[PDB]
Amino acid sequence: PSSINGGIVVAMTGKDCVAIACDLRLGSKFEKIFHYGHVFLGITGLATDVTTLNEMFRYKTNLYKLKEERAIEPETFTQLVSSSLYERRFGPYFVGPVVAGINSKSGKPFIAGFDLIGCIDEAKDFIVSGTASDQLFGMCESLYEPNLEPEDLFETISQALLNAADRDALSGWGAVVYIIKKDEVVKRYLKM
Amino acid sequence: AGLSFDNYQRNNFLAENTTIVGVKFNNGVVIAADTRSTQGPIVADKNCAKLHRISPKIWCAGAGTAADTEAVTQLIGSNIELHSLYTSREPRVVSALQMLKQHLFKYQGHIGAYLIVAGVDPTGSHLFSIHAHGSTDVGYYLSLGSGSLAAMAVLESHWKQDLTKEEAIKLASDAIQAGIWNDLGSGSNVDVCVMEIGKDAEYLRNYLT
Amino acid sequence: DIILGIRVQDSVILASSKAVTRGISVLKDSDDKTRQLSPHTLMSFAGEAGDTVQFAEYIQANIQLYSIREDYELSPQAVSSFVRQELAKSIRSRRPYQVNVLIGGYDKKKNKPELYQIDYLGTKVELPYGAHGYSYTFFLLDHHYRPDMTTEEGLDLLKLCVQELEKRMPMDFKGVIVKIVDKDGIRQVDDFQ
Amino acid sequence: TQQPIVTGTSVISMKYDNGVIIAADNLGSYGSLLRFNGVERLIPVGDNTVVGISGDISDMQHIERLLKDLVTENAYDNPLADAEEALEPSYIFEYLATVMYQRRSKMNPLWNAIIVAGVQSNGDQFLRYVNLLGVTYSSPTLATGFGAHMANPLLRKVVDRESDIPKTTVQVAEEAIVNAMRVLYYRDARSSRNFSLAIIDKNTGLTFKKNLQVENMKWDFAKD
Amino acid sequence: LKKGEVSLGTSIMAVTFKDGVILGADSRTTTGAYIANRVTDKLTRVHDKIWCCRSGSAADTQAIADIVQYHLELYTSQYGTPSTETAASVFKELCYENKDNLTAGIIVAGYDDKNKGEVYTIPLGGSVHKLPYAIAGSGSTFIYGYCDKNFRENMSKEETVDFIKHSLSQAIKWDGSSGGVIRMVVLTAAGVERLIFYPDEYEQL
Amino acid sequence: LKKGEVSLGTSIMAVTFKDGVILGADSRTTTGAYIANRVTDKLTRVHDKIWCCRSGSAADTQAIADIVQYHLELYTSQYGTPSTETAASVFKELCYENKDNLTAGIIVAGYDDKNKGEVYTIPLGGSVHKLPYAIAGSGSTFIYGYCDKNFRENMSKEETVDFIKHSLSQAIKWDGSSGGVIRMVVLTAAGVERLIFYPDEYEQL
Amino acid sequence: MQAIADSFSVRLVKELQYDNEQNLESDFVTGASQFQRLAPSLTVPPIASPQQFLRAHTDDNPDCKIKIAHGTTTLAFRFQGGIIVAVDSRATAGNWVASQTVKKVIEINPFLLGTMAGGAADCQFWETWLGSQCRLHELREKERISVAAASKILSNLVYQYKGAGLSMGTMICGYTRKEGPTIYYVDSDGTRLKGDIFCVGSGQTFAYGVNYKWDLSVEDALYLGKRSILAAASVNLYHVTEDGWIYHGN
Amino acid sequence: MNIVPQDTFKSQVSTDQDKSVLSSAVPSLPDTLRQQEGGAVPLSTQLNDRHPLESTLKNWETTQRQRQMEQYRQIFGIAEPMKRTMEMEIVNRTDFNPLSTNGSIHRDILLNKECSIDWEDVYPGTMVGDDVHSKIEKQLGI
Amino acid sequence: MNIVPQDTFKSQVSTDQDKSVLSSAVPSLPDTLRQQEGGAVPLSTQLNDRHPLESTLKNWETTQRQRQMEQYRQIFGIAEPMKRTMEMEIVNRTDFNPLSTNGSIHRDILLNKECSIDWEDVYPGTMVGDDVHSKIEKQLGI
Amino acid sequence: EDINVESLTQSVCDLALRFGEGASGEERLMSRPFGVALLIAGHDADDGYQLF
Amino acid sequence: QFNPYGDNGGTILGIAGEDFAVLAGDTRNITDYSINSRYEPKVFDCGDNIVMSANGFAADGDALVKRFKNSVKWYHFDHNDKKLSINSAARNIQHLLYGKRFFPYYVHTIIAGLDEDGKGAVYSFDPVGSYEREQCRAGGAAASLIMPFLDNQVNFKKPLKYLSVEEVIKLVRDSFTSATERHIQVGDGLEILIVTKDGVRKEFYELKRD
Known part of the structure; x- marks a missing residue:
């Protein structure tokens, strides 16, 4: 019940939309995806570091909105995450973060991943984080197709998560999926 | 202040429980790299830009810890921009070399960045290699990365003093191509940057494929 | 594994815990850490895994061969000496293994009970009482032991020792099997400790 | 064995249309000391095979003894020992690879990397590699040690696939080998300027060249 | 001394002669067995007629040399x-005070109107020794005898050039970490003269 | 190689000349820094005109030399x-077949009517090399250059004696494990000649 | 005497190490005697510390790791109708597709069953070898071997190699006329323990809730075993009687 | 031409490697009772934790003899080692003293040890199977 | 003339070494509540298991400044380091901004860091005692 | 798999050869030849029913 | 201490059809980041319509294949040239692997052929002899990428039972092309051996060489 370390995060890009999904534990709270207005961050790894990073980024994004008088864009948030991670060069957090979002002015979807000291990997297709399943990357590679509609993208990412969960730990596995458009965000739960 | 040492003991307790070339030619310098980015044996990105810009006419490419390379390059670029504004003069490659050398020596090799730096300034064209511990060296042609041996073989095969711009570009492209073919770390594309005296820098993304 | 033994005026009482290996749940009712060497000599053993059982069965086979060959029974002293020799021999060319044996017998030529203890290095000591496997029962034995105690008083002292042992062990300690060697041979106390 | 003491650096080799070419330098090093000059590391076996050995020198001499004994035992009570019952490169390689794997399995290995080159009786080219672990493989170009990292990229530009073999003449292959040796002398600290070369051709037989030196060295741009 | 650090396996010589001093070195920088740079210049100038060669850690010696050049500009x-x-x-002060953290050895050759050419050696540890001539590096061990048999006081410029060329050719011949061209600087009252000799010249000595 | 074992930190030379061969050595045996024997004889005779010098473990080399002498008596x-x-x-066979258990190196100098004087060196490992001249030991490293500059083929007896004396004097001068007197054996068609030179003679060369 | 001359008459064979008969047999030079040994020959590295070598080289990237048997719960118990053996049949998944159902119970012969634990290869190999030994014994004595004898044979075998690296834990179950039904547990440490109820693997405590009496019917015993496995958690069931074992599946 | 004994480690093991003490009930397994080693000595324990000098001492004389035979073969020919081995085999084969362990005088003469003493000479050294008949069976191979 | 900082380890310890957080009930003991370090941090734990580069990084600039002052003393005389130190002391002494942590412009001019950036500049960085009055008390030494 | 009847018969005959040199070159094992003859009746899939 | 093991990372895949079997492998032989060769086959015809591959340390796999083929020769000599069935071959290979229990081969072994009824059969082995019959198995560096591709393409989606030889060959080629695009150690070439009642057929395809 108190063991929540680990997990997986999958981010994918469609046509004028993005999808970010994470695994969720069983029933009888701790979700690994957070948002800062219209930028979504999913963190895998040590749970205490995940909570610390979420609190720090909420702090920084609130101050940024108060000063700039506008919400922060995915690229700027990516750079901020990179610099914050690099600050702890010799004591780094045991985390793998993934960022997804849509730029307001341009409408271009954006996803990125980070290493534990902030090296940025900007991918045009998808990002997978976590070490729960080794075949999850292969399943995402086999299922992904460029320029998918939000319904098709949701189906693809949900199928990838379900297939990864089937050949892995079971009896309580759940998923949380976010479909992000320029003006609409949909959050869904998968109990399969 | 500075880089933090917090959670060092905690991390210890938890633990207890690329081809880059640079070529000089008669009126400038050329730097070239491959575009394959890997995370272990997995190809993370088939089109990655490894050529970085310290200043409009001073470029570099690195190996080692990627985050360290990027951070050090950006810090030195900020220092170079401020110094150029302060002196109202074009930045010199020697100044960037001095800043990089002293910064790397301060950290006693704990910043894992190995660099090739090429540039053009009012004093001429310059090419340097920089080691993580702070040692620097000068040369007419340099190679770096896991594919550096094949690229160096190609460079030693077809290098001469009187090289034109086109010959230098072809030689750098061939060295990167050899690293691409014979090294598992490289393979996708070739990025080039040509810095010629008296002209703007020319950045060629995906020069070959 | 814990073993205890008390030599009372006319007999020897040996108590062995009916324990089991770790990681596997077993339902059994038998004394697996005791071999009858001769109709008037019993051996209880404690220690590590099957090395000890192999040694005990080897000793039993040798003693049975002697009994068949001579149509005669070795005295407890000779049996203990042979066991000590074999235990010393078994570790002359290998890393020593944890083993501790209590040999209790009734000599009919002398008509008296005898008790011996041999440790893992092959040290044989003749004792009025002994134990192995306990991290104190020594003081309880010292204060409440007399050479001319009867079998009943020895059983009462053994029961006190068992209670003292069980007061500092979990319920996983199922119990102790008790056997008595005297002039009529070897018998099992089916009632209690 | 269990540690190298006196060693040689690298051997390189390639196939061309009508035969094979192999080459190796003439140095035996003693650590950082370039102790022995004049060590022959190409061993001609028969009229059709050349064996190049890199690594421990004492083990190399042991292998030379084994090869000589093999040649002698082939001719034992054999009238046509040089006409039709002469040793083939494949036979020699099979024996050597068996020895290498057996001595690896004994935890008593021979610290060498071996390349066998030659022409079979039917005119086919033979070029194969074995090492101290018993790992064997074949390729149109082969090299050991530092050469494997620098000579192979240069040689594969001439012969990159099987179909390139019929298009490569002896002159082009020899020039490529010489240039690779020059590059190795440039960039290998345990290398020597003196080297030996061997050409095995299905028409002209075996040509063994000794006392070859790296020439045309561009030591001119160091003035400034 | 540091793990994964560039070392200086060089061949260094400095000889005092009648008109001044001459400093000579090879041009090879290696990483293990691979030659990282075959045309490196090892003759470091800290003042117009004060030059040095370095051994040990490359980064430490470069930092020390830069500090010394800055100090000499301040003095000038x-x-x-x-x-x-x-x-x-x-x-010597820089090497000795930091000998627990830096690995550095320096050969210094200088000329001035008062002393007329001098050589100093500072080996590892930080001690200083003034000598008529000095050798250092991994390849120096192979020419200890030869130099001892061929050095004379007050030699002419050409004789000193020949002596250094022969000694460094032998050092290059026997040391795997040494090679390339031979670079020399001649410091006299007339000025500073740079010389270079190529392998095809000194290998036939 | 064995812990607490006597090693051979010597200076060994063997030179072929017009009339035959000459083998020379120093006479110092040390245990760490202490000199255990300053007049030891290192010229080992395995046959009337076949002599050797040994390096590495003293016990292993002595056993190998005794076996070789017995083998040569059987052959004779x-x-x-x-x-x-x-x-x-x-x-070579004895050294190579036992290289995993014994540490031994041998320089062999011989004369016979057919080959007229030969030198062989067997370094650690067991390989064999035939050379016009050979040097070995801890003190040989300091005379690699000098010998390479002063050896000529077909020298006279006196010239060879002088060359060996100078080389070994330098080796003694620079090596702490070498010292004492210089002992030489001259093997020609005339016979075997033993020579000794004292420090007060060769230190003034 | 001429054999001595041949021994002293001559290198190549010595380097090939083929002068030894064992090497020739292992490489099938002189025939197929290697596949004709009742006691298998096991290769060891010719060094001073084979055990340390094996332990270091086994506890370290590709799929070339030694396969470990399932840690799934297995139960065996005995009643007046024979023996009930129940194994949770959840199959682990990897980069492969199974042709049919994977059996976690080894059928030693039509009368003996064994349970896998620890090293899968060790259990399979040595239980097949035990089946061969039992067949030879029954041919010689013209009578079915008792469970005690087979368990003792396996225990002696594994004890001879104790500490070398073998890892196995098995339950030998059999019904003979003389002994009735009998269950032994034998592991790589040499322990040989006769018992009435055995629960091995993860969740053994939950499955040890066996409602157990020596008067249970066959159907009641099968239901009890199935329920115990479900409480520990499909289930594979075996009923061993004097006439052999019968596989039910559930 | 070996000096220190080599190739002393065992390359393969089996439960029936000791043919003289094989069990009659299970011929693939050894008979622990007739081994008389204490009953708790698996063969695997003999493969580890040995004194490094034991193998060198146990095979020293055989190694020296083999080197002598090889030298004779190289210098004299095949016949000399053949004759030495034949003489030694003849002497060793016809000596059968079940009540003694000392070597024969003729063997010592052949080995050139007439006036030589080693620690093997000073220190030359049950319930089951230590009688004359066991030695008869081992000698005759029945 | 130091390059790498030296003499960084502490030679003596005491329970009252940190004078600013001494307890008022027991002046010989520190006040753990006002320390605000988590309440479970003994001083002894700070003497072991430190990153070896932390002391070098923390004292690098001071070491370089001391070397520069020593060079000035050797070459120019006592007056030059005296004046540099006096200027730095005057600038640092009269700056008191309890609501800010950034350094002054004049300090950067004196340190010749007008157009220089390091990681200390990029990364310059409770329930009890983090207010203006604590800084006033520390500054005035009352 | 089941062994062929002819293969088993060949193995038995090879054993019987042991009064001389073995089939694979083994040394002599018996002092005299056997004094018994065998009739081996078998069935295999390859050759049906066989009598040897 | 001397390390007797190495690594020559490659990828193999065995699939059993209705009346055929396929065993494929990449032909790249590498050491660390270097390329030893671009065409070094690892799938061999062992006679009697049995194909074998031992991926991992190349020397151990070559030795195992050599021993198995010699044993097959003696089996033909001693049993009137009887055909060796696939299950008997699997048992022989299990014994060969377990004979090195304390000094194991550092390989993963796949064999393929036709069973007694004519159906395709594939057997997979652990390094010390534990073996099982399977419908499909991938091994090596890129198995975790090849298996999801086949699982998405096929149902074990047209069922595998009704696929033809050409369709299986196409699926193998596509999966290996994807793995070559994603994995640095996979490329150069792909070789496939197909076992049917008519025998063994070889096919070769080129892969990306970077």
Whole structure:
């Protein structure tokens, strides 16, 4: 019940939309995806570091909105995450973060991943984080197709998560999926 | 202040429980790299830009810890921009070399960045290699990365003093191509940057494929 | 594994815990850490895994061969000496293994009970009482032991020792099997400790 | 064995249309000391095979003894020992690879990397590699040690696939080998300027060249 | 000394002669067995007629040499041209005070109107020794005898050039970490003269 | 190689000249920094005109030399005087077949009517090399250059004596494990000649 | 005497190490005697510390790791109708597709069953070898071997190699006329323990809730075993009687 | 031409490697009772934790003899080692003293040890199977 | 003339070494509540298991400044380091901004860091005692 | 798999050869030849029913 | 201490059809980041319509294949040239692997052929002899990428039972092309051996060489 370390995060890009999904534990709270207005961050790894990073980024994004008088864009948030991670060069957090979002002015979807000291990997297709399943990357590679509609993208990412969960730990596995458009965000739960 | 040492003991307790070339030619310098980015044996990105810009006419490419390379390059670029504004003069490659050398020596090799730096300034064209511990060296042609041996073989095969711009570009492209073919770390594309005296820098993304 | 033994005026009482290996749940009712060497000599053993059982069965086979060959029974002293020799021999060319044996017998030529203890290095000591496997029962034995105690008083002292042992062990300690060697041979106390 | 003491650096080799070419330098090093000059590391076996050995020198001499004994035992009570019952490169390689794997399995290995080159009786080219672990493989170009990292990229530009073999003449292959040796002398600290070369051709037989030196060295741009 | 650090496996010589001093070195920088740079210049100038060669850690020696050059510029702004002894003292202080953290050895060759050419050696540890001639590096061990049999006081310039060329050719021949071209600087009252000799010349000596 | 074992930090030379061969050595045996024996004789005779010098473990080399002498007596009982090549082959076989358990290196100098003086060196590992001249030991590293500059083929006896004396004097001068007197054996068609030179003679060369 | 001359008459064979008969047999040079040994020959590295070598080289990237048997719960118990053996049949998944159902119970012969634990290869190999030994014994004595004898044979075998690296834990179950039904547990440490109820693997405590009496019917015993496995958690069931084992599946 | 004994480690093991003490009930397994080693000595324990000098001492004389035979073969020919081995085999084969362990005088003469003493000479050294008949069976191979 | 900082380890310890957080009930003991370090941090734990580069990084600039002052003393005399130190002391002494942590412009001019950036500049960085009055008390030494 | 009847018969005959040199070159094992003859009746899939 | 093991990372895949079997492998032989060769086959015809591959340390796999083929020769000599069935071959290979229990081969072994009824059969082995019959198995560096591709393409989606030889060959080629695009150690070439009642057929395809 108190063991929540680990997990997986999958981010994918469609046509004028993005999808970010994470695994969720069983029933009888701790979700690994957070948002800062219209930028979504999913963190895998040590749970205490995940909570610390979420609190720090909420702090920084609130101050940024108060000063700039506008919400922060995915690229700027990516750079901020990179610099914050690099600050702890010799004591780094045991985390793998993934960022997804849509730029307001341009409408271009954006996803990125980070290493534990902030090296940025900007991918045009998808990002997978976590070490729960080794075949999850292969399943995402086999299922992904460029320029998918939000319904098709949701189906693809949900199928990838379900297939990864089937050949892995079971009896309580759940998923949380976010479909992000320029003006609409949909959050869904998968109990399969 | 500075880089933090917090959670060092905690991390210890938890633990207890690329081809880059640079070529000089008669009126400038050329730097070239491959575009394959890997995370272990997995190809993370088939089109990655490894050529970085310290200043409009001073470029570099690195190996080692990627985050360290990027951070050090950006810090030195900020220092170079401020110094150029302060002196109202074009930045010199020697100044960037001095800043990089002293910064790397301060950290006693704990910043894992190995660099090739090429540039053009009012004093001429310059090419340097920089080691993580702070040692620097000068040369007419340099190679770096896991594919550096094949690229160096190609460079030693077809290098001469009187090289034109086109010959230098072809030689750098061939060295990167050899690293691409014979090294598992490289393979996708070739990025080039040509810095010629008296002209703007020319950045060629995906020069070959 | 814990073993205890008390030599009372006319007999020897040996108590062995009916324990089991770790990681596997077993339902059994038998004394697996005791071999009858001769109709008037019993051996209880404690220690590590099957090395000890192999040694005990080897000793039993040798003693049975002697009994068949001579149509005669070795005295407890000779049996203990042979066991000590074999235990010393078994570790002359290998890393020593944890083993501790209590040999209790009734000599009919002398008509008296005898008790011996041999440790893992092959040290044989003749004792009025002994134990192995306990991290104190020594003081309880010292204060409440007399050479001319009867079998009943020895059983009462053994029961006190068992209670003292069980007061500092979990319920996983199922119990102790008790056997008595005297002039009529070897018998099992089916009632209690 | 269990540690190298006196060693040689690298051997390189390639196939061309009508035969094979192999080459190796003439140095035996003693650590950082370039102790022995004049060590022959190409061993001609028969009229059709050349064996190049890199690594421990004492083990190399042991292998030379084994090869000589093999040649002698082939001719034992054999009238046509040089006409039709002469040793083939494949036979020699099979024996050597068996020895290498057996001595690896004994935890008593021979610290060498071996390349066998030659022409079979039917005119086919033979070029194969074995090492101290018993790992064997074949390729149109082969090299050991530092050469494997620098000579192979240069040689594969001439012969990159099987179909390139019929298009490569002896002159082009020899020039490529010489240039690779020059590059190795440039960039290998345990290398020597003196080297030996061997050409095995299905028409002209075996040509063994000794006392070859790296020439045309561009030591001119160091003035400034 | 540091793990994964560039070392200086060189061949260094400095000889005092009648008209001044000559400093000579090879041009090879290696990483293990791979030659990282075959045309490196090892003759470091800290003042117009005060030069040095370095051994040990490359980064530590470069930092020390930069600090020494800065110190000599500060001294020159006050009192004019420094003596070779002053530069040697500064080198010695920097090497000795940091010997627990830095690995550095320095050969210093200088000329001045008062002392007329001097050589100092500072091996690992930080001690200083003044000598008529000095050798250092991994390849020096192979020419200890030859130099001892062929050095004379007050040699001419050509004789000193020949002596250094022969000694460094032998050092290159026997040491795997040494090779390339031979670079020399001649410091006299006339000025500074740079010389280079190529392998095809000295290998036939 | 064995813990607490006597090592051979010597200076060994063998030179072929017009009339035959000369083998020379120093006379110092040390245990760490203490000199255990300053007049030791290092010229080992395995046959009337076949001599050797040893390096590495003293016990292993002594055992190997005794076995070789016994082998050569057996050979002489059959076929007469053996050649230097045969003795070198026996030494090489003994050293190579036992290289995992014994540490031994041997320099062999011989004379015979057919080959007229030969030198062989068997370094650690067991390989064999035939050379016009050979040097070995801890003090040899300091005379690699000098010998390379002063050896000529077909020298006279006196010139060879002088060359060996100078080289070994330098080796003694620079090596702490070498010292004492210089002992030489001259093997020609005339016979065997033993020579000794004292420190007060060769230190003034 | 001429054999001595041949021994002293001559290198190549010595380097090939083929002068030894064992090497020739292992490489099938002189025939197929290697596949004709009742006691298998096991290769060891010719060094001073084979055990340390094996332990270091086994506890370290590709799929070339030694396969470990399932840690799934297995139960065996005995009643007046024979023996009930129940194994949770959840199959682990990897980069492969199974042709049919994977059996976690080894059928030693039509009368003996064994349970896998620890090293899968060790259990399979040595239980097949035990089946061969039992067949030879029954041919010789013209009578079915008792469970005690087979368990003792396996225990002696594994004890001879104790500490070398073997890892196995098995339950030998059999019904003979003389002994009735009998269950032994034998592991790589040499322990040989006769018992009435055995629960091995993860969740053994939950499955040890066996409602157990020596008067249970066959159907009641099968239901009890199935329920115990479900409480520990499909289930594979075996009923061993004097006439052999019968596989039910559930 | 070996000096220190080599190739002393065992390359393969089996439960029936000791043919003289094989169990009659299970011929693939050894008979622990007739081994008389204490009953708790698996063969695997003999493969580890040995004194490094034991193998060198146990095979020293055989190694020296083999080197002598190889030298004779190289210098004299095949016949000399053949004759030495034949003499030694003849002497060793016809000596059968079940009540003694000392070597024969003729063997010592052949080995050139007439006036030589080693620690093997000073220190030359049950319930089951230590009688004359066991030695008869081992000698005759029945 | 130091390059790498030296003499960084502490030679003596005491329970009252940190004078600013001494307890008022027991002046010989520190006040753990006002320390605000988590309440479970003994001083002894700070003497072991430190990153070896932390002391070098923390004292690098001071070491370089001391070397520069020593060079000035050797070459120019006592007056030059005296004046540099006096200027730095005057600038640092009269700056008191309890609501800010950034350094002054004049300090950067004196340190010749007008157009220089390091990681200390990029990364310059409770329930009890983090107010203006604590800084006033520390500054005034009352 | 089941062994062929002819293969088993060949193995038995090879054993019987042991009064001389073995089939694979083994040394002599018996002092005299056997004094018994065998009739081996078998069935295999390859050759049906066989009598040897 | 001397390390007797190495790594020559490659990828193999065995699939059993209705009346055929396929065993494929990449032909790249590498050491660390270097390329030893671009065409070094690892799938061999062992006679009697049995194909074998031992991926991992190349020397151990070559030795195992050599021993198995010699044993097959003696089996033909001693049993009137009887055909060796696939299950008997699997048992022989299990014994060969377990004979090195304390000094194991550092390989993963796949064999393929036709069973007694004519159906395709594939057997997979652990390094010390534990073996099982399977419908499909991938091994090596890129198995975790090849298996999801086949699982998405096929149902074990047209069922595998009704696929033809050409369709299986196409699926193998596509999966290996994807793995070559994603994995640095996979490329150069792909070789496939197909076993049917008519025998063994070889096919070769080129892969990306970077």
